Amino acid sequence: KVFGRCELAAAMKRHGLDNYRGYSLGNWVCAAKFESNFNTQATNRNTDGSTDYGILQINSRWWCNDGRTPGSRNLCNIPCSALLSSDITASVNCAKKIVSDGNGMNAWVAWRNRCKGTDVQAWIRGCRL
DSSP: OBOOHHHHHHHHHHTTOTTBTTBOHHHHHHHHHHHHTTBTTOEEEOTTSOEEETTTTEETTTTOBOSOSTTOOOTTOSBGGGGGSSSOHHHHHHHHHHHTSSSGGGGSHHHHHHTTTSOGGGGTTTOOO
């Protein structure tokens, strides 16, 4: 499914991402915008043969099992297809594990390059939260 900006902001807030590990809601919405363009079905293969998955483009080398990434870990304990669902619960639960891993939201290259240091509050402006 393709989320709206404010629909997504509201879904993430309900799932506890607002200020999780100190990252305001705007950060999480910007990251989703630039990773997947709000689309839960988004996939992208990497040169290393791992694939990203879902609205926050979680990676099959570390976080989920896809069945085709040798010597991968499955740290979130889910098949990567679980990350492509219209219900974003699996993606949010896994994100919280990722962001707690020492490097923060710098784990998402689109966030680091496109959101970090910007006025991220613009992303949740005008939404009823």
